[PDB]
């Protein structure tokens, strides 16, 4: 049958939680229980769009949707979420997240995030396994995953003391990871108890938010986390303090939260060993201009080489790179073909090279305010005259 007319219906909804539509696709991998509500097969990824597909493809109380509501409160973004089956031993529960090619022909675990491209047009530019990154096993094989995807993998330290996560970020010089130590507490809609969320998805949804209107070159350092209470371990930042917990964790290249009730992030520097790639915007503009350079140069990846093939695409690279300098993504650049590495031997097998040399906008980390109370204006001011 059907209905005609108008149908008012008292339903159970609430808290319209609008966010601007984000473009940067993040990956995701966390456990769930594939019952009758979850219409998603376990080891396969699904293209998520909003809260509804996070509620339809996975469970309501499953650990995917509790991590999908972290990003969809902050940025209406695109999730490539491949869940896993809940295991018993945490040695295998961590190793279920890695997976591999361990099927007959197919893949499983985090290695199904490579299928975001060529299924969804959604290559994950951020990687986050909420909770399953405090282990050494998964976070090593996320840098083994993010180096292939050219992405920033978001991690988290454990729920331990302050120094135990300082020594956990000493195991990586991986120059693409990003560690967020304090775990976000959240309310979860009148459960009257603060659940410790792993706070890797809250920093992941923030990057998709600051990608849209601030741009990818903008540092995601001072900016706000939405849907959050006072976190699990109180991390403060006191000014000029050598032993304050935020500055204790910045020097170990670890992001935190600082403001009251966990408002904003504090990360500017990545989990590297080269100071050349220290910031999280040099490594993000390195890899998010070099897809936009390709997004527009898909024609050049196979073409019959004419005489002007070297010359017409080097004026296509420059004319795209000036549009990044227009919106303030870079400072002045130079793009030019190689006079030394383009011979006749390389043109026969098809290879032909081009140089690109741009420069990042450095973020405003550490503005110093040197100050002095001075009695200079005490004679001219406060006189009889």
């Amino acid at each position: 049958s059907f209905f005609h007319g108008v149908t008012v219906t008292n339903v159970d909804i609430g808290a319209r939680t609008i966010a601007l539509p984000a473009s940067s696709v993040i990956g995701l991998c966390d456990v769930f229980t594939p019952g009758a509500q979850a219409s998603a097969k376990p080891n396969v990824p699904v293209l998520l769009t909003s809260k509804k597909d996070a509620a339809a493809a996975f469970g309501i109380g499953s650990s995917i949707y509790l991590a999908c509501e972290a990003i969809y409160n902050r940025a209406q973004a695109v999730i490539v979420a491949v869940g896993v089956e809940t295991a018993e031993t945490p040695e295998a529960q961590a190793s279920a997240v890695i997976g591999g090619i361990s099927a007959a022909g197919e893949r499983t675990g985090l290695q199904a995030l490579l299928d975001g491209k060529s299924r969804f047009n959604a290559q994950p530019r951020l990687l986050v396994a909420p909770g399953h990154s405090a282990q050494q096993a998964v976070a090593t094989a996320m840098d083994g995953l993010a180096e292939k995807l050219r992405a920033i993998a978001i991690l988290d330290g454990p729920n331990s003391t302050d120094e135990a996560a300082v020594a956990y970020a000493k195991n990586f010089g991986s120059k693409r990871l990003f560690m967020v130590d304090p775990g976000v507490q959240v309310w979860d809609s009148a459960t009257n108890a603060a659940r410790n969320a792993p706070a890797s998805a809250y920093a992941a949804g923030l990057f998709a938010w600051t990608d849209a209107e601030y741009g990818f070159w903008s540092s995601p350092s001072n900016k706000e986390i939405k849907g959050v209470t006072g976190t699990s371990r109180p991390v403060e930042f006191l000014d000029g303090d050598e032993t304050c917990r935020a500055n204790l964790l910045n020097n170990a290249n670890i992001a935190t939260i600082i403001r009251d009730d966990g408002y904003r992030l504090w990360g500017n520097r990545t989990l590297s060993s080269d100071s050349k790639w220290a910031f999280v915007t040099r490594v993000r503009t390195m890899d998010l201009v070099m897809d936009a350079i390709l997004a527009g140069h898909k024609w050049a990846v196979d073409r019959g080489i004419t005489k002007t093939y070297v010359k017409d695409v080097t004026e296509g690279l420059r004319a795209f790179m000036r549009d990044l300098k227009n919106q303030g993504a870079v400072i002045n650049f130079e793009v030019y073909a190689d006079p030394d590495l383009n011979s006749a031997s390389q043109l026969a097998q098809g290879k032909v090279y081009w140089n690109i040399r741009f420069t990042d906008v450095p973020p405003a980390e550490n503005p110093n305010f040197r100050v002095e109370v001075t009695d200079q204006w005490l004679t001219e001011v406060l006189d009889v005259a």
């Binding site: 002007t308 010359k311 004026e315």
Partner: protein
């Protein structure tokens, strides 16, 4: 100096060589927006530079060059890319190339009258944004309106008035 003239001509649009049909190119007429300035204590004005004006770069073809008709009136202005090649051969042999990258909006497709026995002469026009002239491979002009790049002989002329606007 040796006597040096224009002999041959070429046009590329997105790399597509118009080796068949371009009977006329036209580089954009570069001109300074002169404001004649006569003030106190002088006469016979001195014509201060006020920047350039718009640069329309006409050309023509006389076939149905669909590889050039599809750039008219797109929603992406300054996406028509094209270079105006042309070589100046001189009297003592060696030819000096003059190439000229354009980047603008194909703002006019003018099909001429069809008198049934004459040429077609599809007169086109691009109101360019970017303009880069080369002489014998050596750089002479860069004109970029947006973000202010006016570089004569490689050295930028607007750099003295771009770190005061704070661009």
């Amino acid at each position: 100096m040796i006597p040096q003239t224009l002999t041959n001509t070429n046009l590329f649009i997105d790399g597509v060589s118009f080796a068949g049909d371009v009977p006329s190119l036209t580089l954009p007429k570069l001109a300074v927006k002169t404001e004649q300035y006569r003030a106190g204590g002088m006469d016979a004005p001195v014509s201060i530079d006020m920047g350039l004006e718009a640069m329309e770069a006409k050309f023509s073809t006389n076939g149905a060059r669909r590889e050039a008709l599809n750039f008219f009136g797109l929603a992406d202005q300054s996406a028509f890319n094209g270079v105006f090649r042309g070589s100046f051969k001189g009297q003592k042999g060696a030819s000096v190339p003059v190439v000229a990258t354009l980047r603008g909006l194909l703002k006019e497709v003018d099909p001429g009258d069809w008198k049934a026995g004459e040429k077609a002469e599809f007169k086109y026009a691009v109101a360019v944004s970017y303009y880069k002239l080369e002489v014998d491979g050596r750089e002479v002009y860069e004109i970029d309106p947006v973000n202010g790049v006016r570089a004569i002989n490689g050295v930028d002329q607007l750099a003295g008035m771009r770190n005061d606007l704070g661009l």
